[PDB]
Amino acid sequence: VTYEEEAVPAPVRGRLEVLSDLLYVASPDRAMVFTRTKAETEEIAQGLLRLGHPAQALHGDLSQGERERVLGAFRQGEVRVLVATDVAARGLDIPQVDLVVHYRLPDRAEAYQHRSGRTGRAGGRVVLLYGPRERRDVEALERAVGRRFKRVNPPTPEEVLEAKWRHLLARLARVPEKDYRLYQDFAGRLFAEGRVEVVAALLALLL
Amino acid sequence: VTYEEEAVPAPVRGRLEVLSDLLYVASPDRAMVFTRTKAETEEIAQGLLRLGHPAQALHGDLSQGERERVLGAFRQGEVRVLVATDVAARGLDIPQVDLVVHYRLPDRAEAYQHRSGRTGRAGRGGRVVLLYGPRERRDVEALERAVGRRFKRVNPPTPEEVLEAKWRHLLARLARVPEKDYRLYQDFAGRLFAEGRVEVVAALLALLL
Ligand SMILES: [Cl-]
Ligand SMILES: [Cl-]
């Protein structure tokens, strides 16, 4: 197909962090995350938002209105992560994403292909998280799918440090003279004190 | 009535920033801002979010489950600002606060008293702040006749004051980023000093203040 696919090992324990960490590392414009229940999608978006990820759920107990808003902040980039379910995830109103994550594995080819088909705006990415005792299941899914999936380890604690670190860098770079000029004088105060610790700490708040 | 009452001038449609600015300067443990309708409490809440205020809307459409959460966050400190209508602000689940702010003059004078009774926490004292436009310099006089009391007339806060406040607030969260957490970035900081990159630091403070 026109997209890439990887299979990432993660104990259901640290399956959330892995998700987050993978997100920091690639940090794509739009990520679509599928899970098995409405509780999960909600449960999940909650853990993400906590870790510094603009994630919001997408399910059935959603009034078409809150669901246009959700898909609105997602299309505008306000929301970067969409934790969804196969059904809420259906329509014409469903925008395309850059990365697809099967937080829990799909039992059918049509399933995998309905979720995975939501990636590509030019080719895209697809990631599969699996617990240790989920091996065969992935082996079965592969057979249903017809293609095999590369086994890629999870992102390194340092891999993530440097990813966050480089996005923080790109952010400051985006700030404009009109907004940062308001603060130059305070910047001077810090230079004048020249205590490397204060600034490191300010950076620690952001990163 | 022991607490303090004040009338503070707001520009036409700049009541938000004056509110925020008043928040930053006063930094009260809990604040309650009264509005006329829920779309109001809705808008001022989101507004206060932008400007760096942990605030939440409290209107009557809220389920009793949301109601409880919201008010739990507020009593516990997770929410510093509660934005309510008069109807929604009814109940013994509402806690006493440090600051009551009437976003607009109370529709009526009995309303004032009822809003204002919310302020005042033992060992902390309490304060009322009335926000008035320019057409309303008359209305306040009236409210003071109807209530038979004078509100101190208090200048809003000067941009300096505001900035110094955000700043002290910020250095405050910093006083607890253990060395453990920030060490990795000191060299980079050092280079920013050496290469005199004040703008980067400036962009940094923008993203934080
Ligand atoms: Cl389906
Ligand atoms: Cl106005």
Beta-carbon count within 10 A of B177 CB = 17
Q: How far is CA A143 from CA A5, A140, A147, A150, B198, in A?
A: 15, 5, 7, 14, 58
Task: Note the helical H segments in B84-175.
Answer: 109-116, 137-147, 159-174
Answer yes or no: do B205 and A207 touch at CB < 8 A: no
Beta-carbon count within 10 A of A184 CB = 17
> Which phi and psi angles does B34 have, rounded to 5°?
-95, 135
Cα(A130)–Cα(A134) distance, integer angstroms: 6
B160 touches chain A (CB under 8 A): no
Cα(A201)–Cα(B180) distance, integer angstroms: 10
- Give the closest-approach CA distance of B164 to chain A in angstroms: 9
A171 touches chain B (CB under 8 A): yes
- 8 Å CB contact between B23 and B48: yes
The one-letter code for the residue type at B191 is: R
Beta-carbon count within 10 A of A154 CB = 19
Q: Where are the domains of chain A?
A: 1-154, 155-207
Strands B55-58 and B127-132: unpaired
Question: For tokens 């990520």, what's the residue?
Answer: A31
The third-level CATH classification (topology) of the domain covering A155-207 is 6.10.250
Q: Which CATH superfamily is domain B1-156 in?
A: P-loop containing nucleotide triphosphate hydrolases (3.40.50.300)
> What own/partner pairs with CB < 8 Å and gap ≥ 24 does B138-147 have?
B139/B105, B140/B7, B140/B105, B143/B105, B143/B106, B143/B109, B143/B112, B146/B109, B147/B109, B147/B112, B147/B113
| 3 state DSSP class of B154 | coil
For residue A193, the Cα-to-chain-centroid distance in whole angstroms is 39
Resolution (A): 2.3
| 3 state DSSP class of A151 | strand
Question: For tokens 């607030």, what's the residue?
Answer: B169
A87 CA → ligand 1 middle, Å: 6
Cα(B125)–Cα(B4) distance, integer angstroms: 9
Going by C-alpha positions, the residue among B78, B19, B8, B26 that lies closest to residue B48 is B19
The burial of B56, by beta-carbon neighbours within 10 Å (0-12 exposed, 13-18 middle, 19 or more buried), is given as: buried
Cα(A175)–Cα(B167) distance, integer angstroms: 18
Cα(A176)–Cα(B185) distance, integer angstroms: 23
The third-level CATH classification (topology) of the domain covering B157-209 is 6.10.250
Cα(A125)–Cα(A27) distance, integer angstroms: 12
Cα(A180)–Cα(B107) distance, integer angstroms: 41
- What does the DSSP 8-state code read for residue A182? G
| Cβ within 8 Å of residue A11, ≥6 positions away | A131, A132
Expt. technique:
X-ray
* Length of chain B (residues): 209
Answer yes or no: do B202 and A190 touch at CB < 8 A: no
B89 CA → ligand 1 middle, Å: 45
The CATH number that domain A1-154 falls under is 3.40.50.300
